[PDB]
Amino acid sequence: CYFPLQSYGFQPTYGVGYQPYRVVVLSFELLHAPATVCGPKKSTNLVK
Amino acid sequence: DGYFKIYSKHTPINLVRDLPQGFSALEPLVDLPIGINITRFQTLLAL
Numbered sequence: 358c359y360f361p362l363q364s365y366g367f368q369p370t371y372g373v374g375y376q377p378y379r380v381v382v383l384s385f386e387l388l389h390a391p392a393t394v395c396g397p398k399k400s401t402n403l404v405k
Numbered sequence: 406d407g408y409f410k411i412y413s414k415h416t417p418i419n420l421v422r423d424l425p426q427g428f429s430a431l432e433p434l435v436d437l438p439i440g441i442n443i444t445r446f447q448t449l450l451a452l
């Protein structure tokens with residue numbers, strides 16, 4: 358009757374890779390509605 | 406193409422029961438990148 362969850366053990370003594378890492382996945386979808394999010398469109402100085 | 410565009414105008418008037426005999430051009434208010442099909446609409450009134 359095992360439990361499907363296990364509580365992580367993260368003591369500051371532990372070695373690299375045994376240590377906790379914070380992770381984020383960036384994901385997206387395309388080509389079905391207009392692009393609401395985009396990279397920064399840089400601008401130069403203006404000459405006249 | 407997935408944009409929903411609103412244009413509008415205000416004018417003052419003084420009339421009892423019809424749309425007025427004048428020409429006025431609606432300016433764009435806003436463009437909304439909503440991406441969704443529209444086939445029907447409804448309006449909301451103060452009770």
Ligand SMILES: *[C@@H]1O[C@H](CO)[C@@H](O)[C@H](O)[C@H]1NC(C)=O
Nearest residue numbers: 389390407440441442443444
């Ligand atoms: C919008 O409606 C059309 C026609 O039924 C359909 O082909 C299209 O997949 C719809 N788009 C969305 C985002 O539901």
